[PDB]
Amino acid sequence: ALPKLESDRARVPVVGIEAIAPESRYFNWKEYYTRALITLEEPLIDHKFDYGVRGISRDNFGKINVESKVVAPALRR
Amino acid sequence: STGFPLELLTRPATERLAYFENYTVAHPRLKEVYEILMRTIAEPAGASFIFVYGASGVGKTTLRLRVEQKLTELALPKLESDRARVPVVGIEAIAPESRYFNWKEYYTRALITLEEPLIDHKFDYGVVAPALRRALENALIHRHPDVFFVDEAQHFGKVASGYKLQDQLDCLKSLANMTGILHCLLGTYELLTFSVDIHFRRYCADSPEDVQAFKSVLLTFQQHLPLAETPNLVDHWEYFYERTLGCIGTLKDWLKRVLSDALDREATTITLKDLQKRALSVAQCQKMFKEIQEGERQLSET
DNA sequence: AAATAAGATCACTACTGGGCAGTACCAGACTCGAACTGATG
Numbered sequence: 046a047l048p049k050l051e052s053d054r055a056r057v058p059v060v061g062i063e064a065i066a067p068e069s070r071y072f073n074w075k076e077y078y079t080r081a082l083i084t085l086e087e088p089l090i091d092h093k094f095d096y097g098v099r100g101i102s103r104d105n106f107g108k109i110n111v112e113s114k115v116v117a118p119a120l121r122r
Numbered sequence: 123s124t125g126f127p128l129e130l131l132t133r134p135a136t137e138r139l140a141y142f143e144n145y146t147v148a149h150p151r152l153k154e155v156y157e158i159l160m161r162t163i164a165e166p167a168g169a170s171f172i173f174v175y176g177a178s179g180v181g182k183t184t185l186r187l188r189v190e191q192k193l194t195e196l197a198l199p200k201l202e203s204d205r206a207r208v209p210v211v212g213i214e215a216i217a218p219e220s221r222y223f224n225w226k227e228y229y230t231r232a233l234i235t236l237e238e239p240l241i242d243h244k245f246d247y248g249v250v251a252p253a254l255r256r257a258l259e260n261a262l263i264h265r266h267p268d269v270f271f272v273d274e275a276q277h278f279g280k281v282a283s284g285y286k287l288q289d290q291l292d293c294l295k296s297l298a299n300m301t302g303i304l305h306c307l308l309g310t311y312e313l314l315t316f317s318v319d320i321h322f323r324r325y326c327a328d329s330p331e332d333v334q335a336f337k338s339v340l341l342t343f344q345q346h347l348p349l350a351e352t353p354n355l356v357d358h359w360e361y362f363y364e365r366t367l368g369c370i371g372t373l374k375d376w377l378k379r380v381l382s383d384a385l386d387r388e389a390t391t392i393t394l395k396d397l398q399k400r401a402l403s404v405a406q407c408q409k410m411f412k413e414i415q416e417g418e419r420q421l422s423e424t
Numbered sequence: 425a426a427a428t429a430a431g432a433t434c435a436c437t438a439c440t441g442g443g444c445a446g447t448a449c450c451a452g453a454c455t456c457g458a459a460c461t462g463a464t465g
């Protein structure tokens with residue numbers, strides 16, 4: 046997809062994360078959502094995109110930030 | 123004509139894949155259920171729930187899309203003057219991450235799909251999310267949708283409580299009572315765990331008419347497959363029914379897999395091994411048949 | 425029946441949107457003190 050990535054921006058060919066064994070006794074879906082969002086968006090140029098959630102946005106350094114106040118279905122959206 | 127255009131052979135393989143992926147066969151069950159649903163929508167008879175069943179792969183979602191398009195084009199002459207009159211709203215239920223279905227998320231997604239502004243600034247003017255609930259009620263009253271489709275309605279039952287399984291639907295019941303909006307809950311056979319009932323039956327092999335219909339849809343699928351040489355498929359109808367159980371939806375994506383594999387190799391026809399490569403697993407069909415048998419037994423009460 | 429879970433409630437903590445009583449300006453416009461001036465019995 047590299048020629049297509051060069052031709053068209055805002056495009057990732059493949060994204061991949063690893064599931065995390067939880068410290069508690071139940072799987073953490075909020076951590077899954079936030080880490081998938083970090084992996085998907087952080088290794089990108091500052092392509093201005095507005096997710097439909099108030100808390101999550103980009104920063105000056107480009108690293109994505111998620112407030113601890115953000116509720117998990119909002120992260121999923 | 124009844125066959126695929128012969129000009130796509132010179133076109134690139136992506137064009138052939140795009141053409142075949144958009145072909146939606148009108149098998150008799152699909153059009154019969156479509157007519158029943160349209161008759162129910164036109165005259166509701168005072169009902170407010172249009173529960174529709176069917177195991178995965180019958181074609182409920184495409185039926186929803188067809189009904190959406192048909193109702194939009196039916197209303198089209200009268201939205202030129204009347205605005206804020208979205209014909210039909212169709213949403214997909216969210217599988218909860220916790221043990222219980224989330225109703226705040228349902229309300230906010232229903233509001234988003236209606237393009238309702240200022241969702242974050244809602245107010246409660248005197249329950250779960252009263253402000254969002256009242257906002258959705260007002261949006262349904264004023265936008266006046268003909269039907270409110272909720273695909274994947276089986277996720278409403280994620281409550282893990284016998285004394286709360288039926289009560290989980292009180293929010294939708296009250297939202298449909300006081301706004302007068304038809305709620306057509308499309309779901310798999312889990313939805314029978316609980317009003318007009320429609321059954322999206324597959325093609326059971328016991329009845330010869332279903333076998334004839336399955337062979338008909340198989341032939342019309344083979345006619346529209348974009349290959350240089352038309353692949354013979356009706357001979358292995360027994361194989362195509364073993365891994366499909368008679369669902370015209372998963373047959374379509376099975377053929378899509380096989381056709382994409384053929385096109386990627388610049389092939390010209392489909393053999394048995396090509397279908398075997400992209401066939402459903404032996405255990406997968408067993409689990410699917412167990413679930414569909416449970417649903418059929420649940421719906422078998424007369 | 426005793427033991428082990430689990431939701432409900434109170435209480436405190438940290439975080440982040442975000443508006444109202446109030447001031448200021450700039451000509452356009454209306455209304456009428458005060459006067460000016462001409463016709464008239």
Ligand SMILES: Nc1ncnc2c1ncn2[C@@H]1O[C@H](COP(=O)(O)OP(=O)(O)OP(=O)(O)O)[C@@H](O)[C@H]1O
Pocket residue numbers: 143145146147148149152177178179180181182183184274309310370371372374375
């Ligand atoms: N009759 C049909 N003709 C052509 N394609 C179809 C048909 N029915 C379904 N599809 C295809 O199947 C996909 C949609 O899933 P499908 O309708 O088969 O499943 P469903 O059982 O209705 O849905 P779900 O399992 O999510 O409840 C799309 O790719 C659509 O093109």
Ligand SMILES: [Mg+2]
Pocket residue numbers: 182183273274
């Ligand atoms: Mg579906």
